[PDB]
């Protein structure tokens, strides 16, 4: 499924991401935009053997299990397959656990290069929420 910007911001807000552990709502929209282009089915296989899954590109080495990944830790206790769905539930539930580590949103590399230190609330302006 490919979200529109305002569609994803209204969904991420119903999913409790507005101001979750100090991160305002535009951070989450800007992150989805550069990590997956708003696509719930995006997948990317990495240099290291891991694969990144879904709309928030959750990694198979630390967070979900894809059975092909070496030191797999499965912190979200979830098969990677469950994050490639149109329903954003599972991807939000795991992302809330990811951000609750001391590294915060720095675990999303596109967010670190394209959103941090930018006016992230622009990602939610012009929308009915």
């Amino acid at each position, epitope marked *: 499924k490919v979200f529109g910007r305002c569609e994803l911001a209204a969904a991420m807000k119903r999913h*409790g991401l507005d101001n*979750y552990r100090g991160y305002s709502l535009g951070n989450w929209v800007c992150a989805a935009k550069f990590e997956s282009n708003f696509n719930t089915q995006a997948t990317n296989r990495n240099t290291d053997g891991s694969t990144d899954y879904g709309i928030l590109q959750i990694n198979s080495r630390w967070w979900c299990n894809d059975g092909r990944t070496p030191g797999s830790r499965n*912190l979200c206790n979830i098969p990677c397959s469950a994050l490639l769905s149109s329903d954003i539930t599972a991807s939000v539930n795991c992302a809330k656990k990811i951000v609750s580590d001391g590294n915060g949103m720095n675990a999303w590399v596109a967010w670190r290069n394209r959103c941090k230190g930018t006016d992230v609330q622009a990602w939610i302006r012009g929308c009915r929420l």
Partner: antibody
Amino acid sequence: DVQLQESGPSLVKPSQTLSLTCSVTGDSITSDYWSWIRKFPGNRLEYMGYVSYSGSTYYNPSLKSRISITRDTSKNQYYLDLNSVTTEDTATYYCANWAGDYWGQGTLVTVSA
Amino acid sequence: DIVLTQSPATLSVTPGNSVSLSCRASQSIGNNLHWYQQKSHESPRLLIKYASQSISGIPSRFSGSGSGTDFTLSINSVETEDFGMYFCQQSNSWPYTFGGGTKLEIK
């Protein structure tokens, strides 16, 4: 299946350091975030803190910095240290995973002369 | 620092009735609110996550709703094994906090 178990003394003196241990069985401690919760005598619950996978820690400010949470990956345990206890630290201490899915049985610690 | 207020503090009911418990947040926490049960001399038990997400192994008679600042836990036909303490907890902001508790007493 995961099981959690608290251990440590049940009676401590004012001003010493309370130390408790949480042994985890059924899965490695490297697969979750782990926390300490305590229940005061009138049903009052207090989330003390948690350690996350990177080793970073989150401590409740009500503790005033007397707490430390560390873990031992080879023993599969994690630990609570609480410095300079007073009679106000009298409570039932629980270990639990970060989301509240698994909890130990709880251990009543009494602080007294 | 989020304060969660639970009402009523005590609720007496007869087996087979339906009850509703409230948990109110002093600030908006979106859907970041979990409910636990605690029976006498037992550890807390997680019943509901994120305001309405159900959890395997829990009776279906429990469900939760609400968002922002106002949340509810309902129990359809309360059974005897339901009597004890009920607490809500927010995980939106550090420190995580708990509500004062509602007791469900057999009437």
